[PDB]
């Protein structure tokens, strides 16, 4: 029987982040309105100011 | 190649004749103790391992159990009558088996046994 290449609720990669930003520091984007890019190539805007 | 202290680790063989005399006197000490007996034990004929040296034979450690049995010499008696025994070696070949049983038959033919006490 064939395998379904699917992630189960125990895999380290079940819940994948949206930021598409790796293990780099967030010292970048400090002076930018956005934080990273998504899958489709659209940047992720910072929510608001506290 | 003298980056280390060879001067404190250097050795000279000025006692080569002295050690030769000492070893010869040791062989005579063994033959004074084992006077009618040979000063060594009968060792088997073994073929050298690798392809480089497999065309020649040498003396091995001891005779195998089943080649002693084929020669007709009991296990518990062979080391007593002066035959080295090697329980680790396997014959693996009728050629080695036959060579060693022939050697043991020659030893049997040339041996003299004294009757206990």
């Amino acid at each position: 029987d064939e395998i379904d290449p699917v992630y189960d609720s125990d895999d380290t990669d079940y819940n994948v982040p949206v930021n598409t930003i790796g293990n780099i520091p967030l010292s970048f984007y400090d002076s930018y309105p956005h934080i990273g890019y998504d899958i489709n190539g659209k940047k992720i805007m910072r929510p608001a100011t506290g | 190649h003298f980056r280390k202290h060879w001067q404190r680790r250097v050795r000279c063989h000025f006692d080569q004749p002295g050690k030769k005399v000492t070893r010869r006197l040791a062989r005579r000490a063994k033959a004074a103790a084992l006077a009618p007996r040979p000063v060594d034990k009968l060792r088997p004929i073994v073929r050298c391992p690798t392809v480089k040296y497999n065309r020649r034979t040498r003396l091995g450690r001891g005779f195998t159990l089943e080649e002693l049995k084929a020669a007709g010499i009991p296990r518990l008696l062979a080391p007593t009558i002066g035959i080295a025994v090697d329980h680790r070696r396997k014959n693996l070949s009728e050629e080695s088996l036959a060579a060693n049983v022939q050697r043991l038959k020659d030893y049997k033919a040339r041996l003299i046994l004294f009757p206990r006490k």
Partner: protein, 183 residues
Amino acid sequence: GALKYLEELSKKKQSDVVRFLLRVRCWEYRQLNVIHRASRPSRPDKARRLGYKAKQGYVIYRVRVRRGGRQLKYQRSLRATAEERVGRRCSNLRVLNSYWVNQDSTYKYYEVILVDPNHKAIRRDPRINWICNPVHKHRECRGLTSTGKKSRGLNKGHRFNKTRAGRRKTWKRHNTLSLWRYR
């Protein structure tokens, strides 16, 4: 066969029974002294397998040594440290062999089997009069026990070329310049 049952039970260490016994026993050892005489082996199968006999002359002493490191790593083992301390306390006995009995998070507990070389039973019995002979003084201090052999690397093969037959001896032999009479 009770010793075989205990062997399997001791292999099953994190099992419930063994874990319970090790806990309440670790508390006892923490309440007792750091080095103390153990009236009997806590692991009789391990003791008899390592050579403990129920004669007059075989003593068992239990010791706890602090675990961890000095980032420097000590070349000998906590077993070696425990054996050396037990021998120094019982300077008149010969350390036969030691074994782990309990671990704990800050200490580590070993029972050391020792033999009296001066007791008549030991002197008359073979299999132990070798340890009566004087070449076996302070085996734990010279690395002649099981942990000492393991740490010094007394195994045969290609993975122990430098360390078998003595590391310092091998280095000295390789670093001697040999000059013969007729060169």
